[PDB]
Design a protein around this ligand. Sequence first.
Ligand SMILES: CCCCCCCCCCCCCCCCCC(=O)OC[C@H](COP(=O)([O-])OCC(O)COP(=O)([O-])OC[C@@H](COC(=O)CCCCCCCCCCCCCCCCC)OC(=O)CCCCCCCCCCCCCCCCC)OC(=O)CCCCCCCCCCCCCCCCC
Ligand SMILES: CCCCCCCCCCCCCCCCCC(=O)OC[C@H](COP(=O)([O-])OCC(O)COP(=O)([O-])OC[C@@H](COC(=O)CCCCCCCCCCCCCCCCC)OC(=O)CCCCCCCCCCCCCCCCC)OC(=O)CCCCCCCCCCCCCCCCC
Ligand SMILES: CCCCCCCCCCCCCCCCCC(=O)OC[C@H](COP(=O)([O-])OCC(O)COP(=O)([O-])OC[C@@H](COC(=O)CCCCCCCCCCCCCCCCC)OC(=O)CCCCCCCCCCCCCCCCC)OC(=O)CCCCCCCCCCCCCCCCC
Ligand SMILES: CCCCCCCCCCCCCCCCCC(=O)OC[C@H](COP(=O)([O-])OCC(O)COP(=O)([O-])OC[C@@H](COC(=O)CCCCCCCCCCCCCCCCC)OC(=O)CCCCCCCCCCCCCCCCC)OC(=O)CCCCCCCCCCCCCCCCC
Ligand SMILES: CCCCCCCCCCCCCCCCCC(=O)OC[C@H](COP(=O)([O-])OCC(O)COP(=O)([O-])OC[C@@H](COC(=O)CCCCCCCCCCCCCCCCC)OC(=O)CCCCCCCCCCCCCCCCC)OC(=O)CCCCCCCCCCCCCCCCC
Ligand SMILES: CCCCCCCC/C=C/CCCCCCCC(=O)OC[C@H](COP(=O)(O)OCCN)OC(=O)CCCCCCC/C=C/CCCCCCCC
Lengths: 37, 269, 119, 119, 68, 62
Amino acid sequence: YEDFVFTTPYFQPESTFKSVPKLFSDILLGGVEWVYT
Amino acid sequence: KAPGQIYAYDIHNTHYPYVNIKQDSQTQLLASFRRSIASINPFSYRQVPSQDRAAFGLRWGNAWYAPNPYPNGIHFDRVFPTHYDPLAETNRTKANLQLIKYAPGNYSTLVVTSEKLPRPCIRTIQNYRRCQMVNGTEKCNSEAQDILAICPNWALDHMKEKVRFYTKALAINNQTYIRAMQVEEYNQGRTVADVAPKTWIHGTRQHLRPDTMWADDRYTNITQTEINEAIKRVEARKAREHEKKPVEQANVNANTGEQPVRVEKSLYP
Amino acid sequence: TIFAETWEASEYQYRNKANLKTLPVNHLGKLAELKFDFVEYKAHQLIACHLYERMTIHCMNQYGLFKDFYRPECLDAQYYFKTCVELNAAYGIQKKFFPEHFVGSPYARPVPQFQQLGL
Amino acid sequence: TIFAETWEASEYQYRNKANLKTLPVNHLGKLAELKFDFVEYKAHQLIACHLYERMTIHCMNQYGLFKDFYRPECLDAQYYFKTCVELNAAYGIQKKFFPEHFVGSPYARPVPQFQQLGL
Amino acid sequence: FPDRGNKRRWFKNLFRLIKNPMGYIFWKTYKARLAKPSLIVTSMFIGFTLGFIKLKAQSIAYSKKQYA
Amino acid sequence: DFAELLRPLRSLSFNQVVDRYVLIPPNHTFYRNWTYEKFLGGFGLSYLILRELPLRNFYARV
Ligand SMILES: CCCCCCCCCCCCCCCCCC(=O)OC[C@H](COP(=O)([O-])OCC(O)COP(=O)([O-])OC[C@@H](COC(=O)CCCCCCCCCCCCCCCCC)OC(=O)CCCCCCCCCCCCCCCCC)OC(=O)CCCCCCCCCCCCCCCCC
Ligand SMILES: CCCCCCCCCCCCCCCCCC(=O)OC[C@H](COP(=O)([O-])OCC(O)COP(=O)([O-])OC[C@@H](COC(=O)CCCCCCCCCCCCCCCCC)OC(=O)CCCCCCCCCCCCCCCCC)OC(=O)CCCCCCCCCCCCCCCCC
Ligand SMILES: CCCCCCCCCCCCCCCCCC(=O)OC[C@H](COP(=O)([O-])OCC(O)COP(=O)([O-])OC[C@@H](COC(=O)CCCCCCCCCCCCCCCCC)OC(=O)CCCCCCCCCCCCCCCCC)OC(=O)CCCCCCCCCCCCCCCCC
Ligand SMILES: CCCCCCCCCCCCCCCCCC(=O)OC[C@H](COP(=O)([O-])OCC(O)COP(=O)([O-])OC[C@@H](COC(=O)CCCCCCCCCCCCCCCCC)OC(=O)CCCCCCCCCCCCCCCCC)OC(=O)CCCCCCCCCCCCCCCCC
Ligand SMILES: CCCCCCCCCCCCCCCCCC(=O)OC[C@H](COP(=O)([O-])OCC(O)COP(=O)([O-])OC[C@@H](COC(=O)CCCCCCCCCCCCCCCCC)OC(=O)CCCCCCCCCCCCCCCCC)OC(=O)CCCCCCCCCCCCCCCCC
Ligand SMILES: CCCCCCCC/C=C/CCCCCCCC(=O)OC[C@H](COP(=O)(O)OCCN)OC(=O)CCCCCCC/C=C/CCCCCCCC
């Protein structure tokens, strides 16, 4: 670019329209441990 | 319907070998007396196990015996640095609370283990392999998706890593192959026809003399006069060998502020 | 940018880092601490950080900015509005350039292709 | 396989794992616990695990395997020899197929190529 | 000279405690137990003592959890 | 002595060795831990006898 070289592989513009359906995933702060007394 | 006996019982023919490791006169005398009356002694304990009765280990006086744990330099200090050396003493001193804690596994070795994948995840793999060898890979997409869905994510990470390890182990075994199957300069053009009809015994001490002067009686009749005459001859040959000497190389570890190369250590300080 | 009134709380929690902050919905209880009369529609209270902005305008219209705006109900509204738009700007950038940090992203813990399993 | 009498103690320590064991040199002090007379050369005491084996042979020649070999100095020699060849076989295999586990390996913490720095 | 009649007196009381601990504790505390507190105070002593021992046992069991 | 450890094996075939020392018929009805109960339980029985020592001095029995 402006007196600078940034080596990157060939960009694929088709990756923009990649169908990625969102999946359910819930985090439970406060859950089960490995062992109990 | 007699109880089964282990192979050790036929070696000793008794269940009560009073084996005590403590080698003092009092202990071995009492053990010999107890070994003789063990048939009618109510205070008798087995040291040879069986199917019907368990047994005790080796006795150490009144306590029990266990070998000294293999020397281990790992330890953890409490009050002051003890500089523990496992080779400085014969028997390992007991760990005091305020002095030291030794490494875990007094009697332990290094092994390789593997987790067992879940049963439902195993069944999906068996279903894919079976469907593969019968219908081919191209008609097993559904069975492949069942593996990605049912197997937990940690199992899939283990399956992914096994392929990468065995790829590494494959390259390592093949590099050993290339070094092994490489023909050295002293074996150029030599085949199995040039091998001598010798076996392992033909290279032992009886047939091939070791490189030591007193391995046999070869030099036992050598007098001092013949020694002086030999020193003259070995110095005559050095008038042709000493003419050349390798050149001193530059020191790659000159800078002490640089990570030094692990160079071959000198034979002598 | 969040293009809705509501967002999943878990989608703004970190998966590989300790969760020390959340991105909570607007605190509607602070709206009842305003002593004066004002008109507020329920259609504007759920969008992020905007309720605190409207509360600040209502407080700066009733009072000014000098010795009358300095009351606990009005200063918390301005502080919440400033803090809300700062946290959302940071979470928005982190959602855009670090989507793999959050729970629910397929890249937080990537599932391998079947060709990597060696079967 | 170690092709020398001596090895760097740090070359068999783990870099990314807790160090709970060492690979010590042969315990020469155990040789002086044998009460009987024997001939042992110093040129054989440094190579790994071999001194314990020669001690076991000396004890199995002086004593047998029954009621006379069972003394503390002779059982520790047999136990050390069995344990030494078991650890060295495990460390040797781990040195062959897992070289990046140990301190001193360039793959334990790989230094990047200059092309990866983007300068 | 010292009082030689008091020699080894701490050992002798220890062995008498091992021989009959309840008989030793009974007579050593007899005059003190002549003044008996209320049922409430006695219950609080037992309640807080056994409660401290119960928590001590749970702390021991947690140490086995950390060892595992 | 190494050949003495294999003495009970030289008189047997491989099938006899497996049936003799490997394929012991399963019988899980034995009180195997009686060996330990007798040994460690003997301390309590020995105390019952030892607590009756006619040593007159109390501190001698201590
Ligand atoms: C070169 C080769 C050879 C090398 C040899 C090396 C060894 C050297 C040998 C020579 C050494 C001795 C020299 C001559 C000494 C002469 C002095 C003298 O006149 O006697 C004084 C002393 C007078 O006692 P006393 O007047 O009758 O009564 C004491 C008072 O009345 C008070 O009685 P009390 O009822 O009121 O109880 C209080 C008492 C005791 O009460 C206590 O609280 C102490 C408790 C200690 C035991 C418990 C420890 C805790 C751990 C175990 C738990 C036990 C629990 C039991 C219950 C089970 C669970 C409920 O307090 C004491 O400390 C009394 C101890 C004696 C006083 C000395 C000064 C001590 C002050 C510093 C104290 C700290 C050290 C204490 C050491 C242990 C004391 C027993 O007598 C002795 O102690 C004799 C000791 C010498 C015996 C020599 C034996 C032969 C030596 C060779 C044997 C081989 C050794 C091999 C070693 C190998 C190397 C490791
Ligand atoms: C300070 C706070 C912290 C305190 C920590 C806790 C202290 C330890 C507590 C341990 C509890 C164990 C319970 C034992 C059951 C005893 C039941 C009973 O009725 O006792 C009578 C019982 C005597 O009845 P006996 O059987 O008819 O014996 C009379 C014969 O004439 C005896 O013949 P003799 O008079 O001619 O002999 C002389 C006499 C006096 O001479 C001596 O005792 C001095 C020599 C003592 C040696 C050092 C002892 C080291 C510890 C003992 C061994 C380890 C534990 C063994 C198992 C014990 C548990 C059963 O010996 C005896 O009194 C009896 C011998 C003592 C036992 C010796 C053999 C030990 C091994 C036993 C083998 C049998 C069981 C197999 C093992 C079981 C394992 C599953 O006393 C004992 O046997 C020992 C008492 C043990 C407790 C002593 C400390 C209690 C008080 C602690 C402080 C309390 C604070 C809370 C109160 C707050 C107050 C305000
Ligand atoms: C190896 C284990 C190591 C750890 C454990 C170590 C354990 C060591 C301690 C052993 C036991 C303590 C020693 C007692 C000495 C002998 C008995 C005695 O006291 O002589 C009677 C004598 C007078 O009683 P009396 O002549 O029979 O007259 C009463 C009449 O019978 C009629 O009564 P009244 O109508 O005139 O008055 C009603 C009643 C008043 O009502 C009461 O009695 C008050 C106490 C009710 C129950 C309190 C909870 C139970 C405490 C034990 C359970 C442990 C709790 C868990 C602790 C967790 C934190 C560590 O008065 C009394 O009955 C006596 C009260 C005098 C206070 C009692 C002594 C202090 C409390 C016990 C100490 C606790 C230490 C154990 C834990 C230590 C851990 C390091 O008391 C005195 O000695 C006078 C001293 C001054 C006392 C007043 C000022 C106390 C200032 C210090 C308080 C310390 C509190 C510690 C709290 C623990 C931490 C939360
Ligand atoms: C026609 C009438 C009906 C017939 C009546 C017949 C009654 C038969 C009497 C026979 C007496 C029992 C004989 C054997 C025991 C003698 C030895 C003894 O231990 O006595 C204590 C004895 C004497 O105690 P003291 O310090 O001298 O005080 C004497 C009196 O308490 C006085 O102390 P004070 O002067 O300081 O009075 C002030 C009082 C002040 O109290 C008040 O002003 C009002 C109290 C209101 C209570 C509020 C209750 C609230 C409940 C809430 C619960 C919520 C949770 C529920 C959850 C459920 C699930 C949803 O505060 C207290 O002292 C309370 C003391 C503890 C009371 C516990 C029981 C209360 C209810 C009893 C009901 C019995 C039926 C009554 C029918 C008549 C009704 C008009 O204490 C000792 O020192 C000896 C050793 C004690 C060791 C402690 C651990 C022993 C554990 C075993 C004990 C024996 C087995 C159990 C037997 C019953 C014991 C509770
Ligand atoms: C008719 C008139 C008289 C004519 C006959 C006179 C001659 C009599 C002698 C011949 C007849 C004896 C009958 C039994 C045959 C035994 C044959 C044999 O070889 O035994 C060797 C026997 C065992 O030798 P060991 O292999 O070295 O085992 C002992 C180790 O300590 C073991 O240590 P450990 O660590 O290796 O193992 C721990 C051990 C537990 O061991 C211990 O913990 C004991 C540790 C000793 C205390 C520690 C201090 C040690 C001090 C060292 C110095 C001690 C010197 C004592 C010298 C005593 C000389 C006998 O636990 C066990 O292993 C299992 C124990 C459970 C066994 C089941 C009990 C069956 C006993 C028989 C029941 C029926 C008899 C009647 C009931 C008893 C009488 C009321 O030697 C002993 O005698 C040990 C002393 C035991 C005390 C004997 C007291 C009973 C005597 C009964 C006499 C008759 C009753 C009164 C009738 C009065 C009117 C007539
Ligand atoms: C102990 C209490 C005695 C009185 C009992 C009264 C109550 C009666 C009710 C009893 C109900 C019975 C329920 C079933 C109990 C089962 C018993 C049991 O499990 O152990 C039996 C088991 C059988 O052994 P195995 O052959 O290995 O097993 C085969 C199984 N078919 O017995 C034993 O192991 C032996 C130990 C049992 C107790 C021994 C008692 C020893 C006492 C010693 C005093 C005798 C003097 C000795 C002098 C020695 C002289 C040389």
